[PDB]
Amino acid sequence: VPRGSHMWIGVISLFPEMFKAITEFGVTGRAVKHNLLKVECWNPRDFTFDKHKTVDDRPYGGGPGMLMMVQPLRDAIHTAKAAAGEGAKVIYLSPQGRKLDQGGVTELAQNQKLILVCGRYEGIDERLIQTEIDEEWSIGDYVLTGGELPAMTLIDAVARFIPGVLADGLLDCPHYTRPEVLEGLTVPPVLMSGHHEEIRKWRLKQSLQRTWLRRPELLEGLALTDEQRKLLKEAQAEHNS
Amino acid sequence: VPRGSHMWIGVISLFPEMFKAITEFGVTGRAVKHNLLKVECWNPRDFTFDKHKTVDDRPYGGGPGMLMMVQPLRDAIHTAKAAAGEGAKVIYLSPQGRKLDQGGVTELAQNQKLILVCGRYEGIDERLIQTEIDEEWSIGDYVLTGGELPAMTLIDAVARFIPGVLADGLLDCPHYTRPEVLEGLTVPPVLMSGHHEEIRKWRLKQSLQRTWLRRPELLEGLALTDEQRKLLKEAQAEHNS
Ligand SMILES: Nc1ncnc2c1ncn2[C@@H]1O[C@H](CO)[C@@H](O)[C@H]1O
Numbered sequence: 479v480p481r482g483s484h485m486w487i488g489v490i491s492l493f494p495e496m497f498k499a500i501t502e503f504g505v506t507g508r509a510v511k512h513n514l515l516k517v518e519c520w521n522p523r524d525f526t527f528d529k530h531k532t533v534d535d536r537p538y539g540g541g542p543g544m545l546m547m548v549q550p551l552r553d554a555i556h557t558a559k560a561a562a563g564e565g566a567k568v569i570y571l572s573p574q575g576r577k578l579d580q581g582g583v584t585e586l587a588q589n590q591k592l593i594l595v596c597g598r599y600e601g602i603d604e605r606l607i608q609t610e611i612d613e614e615w616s617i618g619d620y621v622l623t624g625g626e627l628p629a630m631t632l633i634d635a636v637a638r639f640i641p642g643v644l645a646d647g648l649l650d651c652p653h654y655t656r657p658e659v660l661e662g663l664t665v666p667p668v669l670m671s672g673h674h675e676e677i678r679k680w681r682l683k684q685s686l687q688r689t690w691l692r693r694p695e696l697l698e699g700l701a702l703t704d705e706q707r708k709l710l711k712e713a714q715a716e717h718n719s
Numbered sequence: 720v721p722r723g724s725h726m727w728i729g730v731i732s733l734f735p736e737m738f739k740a741i742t743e744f745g746v747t748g749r750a751v752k753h754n755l756l757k758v759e760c761w762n763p764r765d766f767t768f769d770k771h772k773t774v775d776d777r778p779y780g781g782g783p784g785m786l787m788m789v790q791p792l793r794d795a796i797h798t799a800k801a802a803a804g805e806g807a808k809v810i811y812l813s814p815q816g817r818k819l820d821q822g823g824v825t826e827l828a829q830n831q832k833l834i835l836v837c838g839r840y841e842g843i844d845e846r847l848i849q850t851e852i853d854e855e856w857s858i859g860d861y862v863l864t865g866g867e868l869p870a871m872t873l874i875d876a877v878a879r880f881i882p883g884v885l886a887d888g889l890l891d892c893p894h895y896t897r898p899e900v901l902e903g904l905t906v907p908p909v910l911m912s913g914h915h916e917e918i919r920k921w922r923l924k925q926s927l928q929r930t931w932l933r934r935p936e937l938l939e940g941l942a943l944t945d946e947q948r949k950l951l952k953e954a955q956a957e958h959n960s
Pocket residue numbers: 571572573596597598599600601602615616617618619620621622623624625626628
């Protein structure tokens with residue numbers, strides 16, 4: 479199985495078993511079994527030395543909640559970097575990071591090795607971010623209970639760009655399958671015509687219309703081709719009239 | 720255990736076992752064990768009648784990829800709705816949906832029952848979205864291999880708003896814990912002062928500064944209090960000088 483552009487992802491997490499969600503199911507799972515993608519985990523808890531294996535600590539300045547204990551976390555990260563070798567970008571998932579989007583995903587997919595730091599509690603010591611982290615990334619403007627889901631969201635997204643694992647700046651067009659009529663709703667005839675060029679145009683027009691109606695801001699960031707400007711103008715006219 | 724505002728989430732997915740990621744670990748896992756949150760899954764595969772339990776189908780109009788087979792998917796959804804009863808908002812996760820953000824999460828947390836439809840392959844028939852789905856939500860402007868992660872991201876986010884499970888429009892302030900000095904980096908003295916009012920102000924100022932430097936757009940959507948306008952002006956002056 480062509481492993482040309484395989485990708486290696488190191489993960490620091492208090493709950494390594496969560497990653498089975500992507501390593502044991504669907505396309506990512508097959509990607510892993512086929513060695514196109516490799517996810518390796520290290521758990522801070524294994525780096526503790528106290529009897530109760532404490533992985534959290536109190537924050538200076540008081541306040542609700544806890545933080546990840548520095549020592550065990552720091553040791554796990556160092557161990558991960560040693561295993562990844564040179565040329566491994568370390569990422570910390572958090573809401574204060576760069577907001578992930580398609581463009582950001584493709585950039586991340588350029589890396590052959592990545593180490594993802596998943597925090598729990600209120601996060602991690604600001605100083606570790608300065609001394610151990612290369613970049614902070616957020617999957618969205620919302621707060622989660624841990625960095626695992628965000629980490630898995632990032633892995634899943636980049637995995638699609640790995641050759642062998644498997645829009646145009648616009649939203650997807652509507653998709654249809656059997657049956658021809660579903661609760662009175664029929665499949666658009668053009669899709670049944672077999673006319674590939676018309677089908678291409680119809681789908682592109684739908685994407686433009688749909689993007690225009692639901693996410694107009696996305697259109698400003700685009701430099702439309704003459705064909706796209708025409709199809710868009712058409713959809714808007716049909717929508718107005 | 721006060722189950723006052725418990726929440727019920729129905730899930731339609733070809734990979735129910737993925738949800739263990741949130742039902743068996745951390746705060747969401749404890750929330751589930753304590754009955755504050757209940758996640759119930761239905762798998763389309765169980766609703767197939769052919770020998771090979773086929774859950775995908777070809778899209779009309781040709782094109783790469785497949786779609787979820789309508790019949791098994793439709794049947795699972797109907798079964799889920801019957802179990803949820805009246806007053807259950809059905810959500811389909813997809814990039815064409817409303818982009819999730821803190822505000823959207825709080826709105827979703829108002830619901831006592833939710834049914835999340837997770838697609839695989841290229842998604843689901845456009846017509847099912849019109850006849851079975853109430854709202855489409857996206858966790859971000861990036862494409863994933865399935866709706867499970869997005870579904871779990873949504874559940875995790877709303878779960879935090881359920882009383883008993885556990886920012887200000889601004890990014891979080893930096894957090895610190897032991898030790899006082901880490902690789903030459905010392906904890907900001909104010910945090911060690913014990914002066915709660917100064918600590919409050921210092922954190923608020925950091926959030927304003929941090930939000931201003933990393934995500935200035937987030938500030939335009941805010942109507943700052945006099946205190947916040949003062950602290951922000953201060954941070955910008957200190958940053959300039
Ligand atoms: N939207 C998000 N994107 C990335 N990481 C997040 C997000 N929300 C919370 N986290 C991380 O989960 C942990 C607990 O909040 C912290 O490490 C925090 O940075």
